[PDB]
């Protein structure tokens, strides 16, 4: 149902962007940057700083290959969503 829908949206959106520079399971820093700028626009303001996209990726980048794996993306999403849930206590 709704959670599945949300989930397959996350999977799909990630997958296609990850196809551009990466390999479906992993967003390269270009793709992570673009994804954040393009899609996370309300939650994070735009990110010109190729340094910072690399930093926030590097922070989670278990593979150390200048990408972030779907796992790391989900981990990032978890804390971001939790912050938004804390917000949502007082919509």
């Amino acid at each position: 149902s709704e959670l599945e829908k949300a989930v397959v949206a996350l999977i799909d959106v990630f997958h296609q962007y990850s196809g551009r520079e990466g390999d479906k399971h992993k967003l390269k820093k270009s793709e992570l940057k673009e994804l954040i700028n393009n899609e996370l626009s309300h939650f994070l303001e735009e990110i010109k700083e190729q340094e910072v996209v690399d930093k926030v990726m590097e922070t989670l980048d278990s593979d150390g290959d200048g990408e972030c794996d779907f796992q790391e993306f989900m981990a990032f999403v978890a804390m971001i969503t939790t912050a938004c849930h804390e917000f949502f206590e007082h919509e």
Binding site: I36, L44, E45, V52, E86, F87, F88, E89
Partner: peptide, 26 residues
């Protein structure tokens, strides 16, 4: 001695401010 050499400043703040704001409600 402590010059402003640290170009590697917390530029992250520029964006993460919104996250901090959302955490703020707790």
């Amino acid at each position: 001695k402590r010059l402003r050499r640290s170009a590697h400043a917390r530029k992250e703040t520029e964006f993460l401010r919104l996250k901090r704001t959302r955490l703020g409600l707790e």
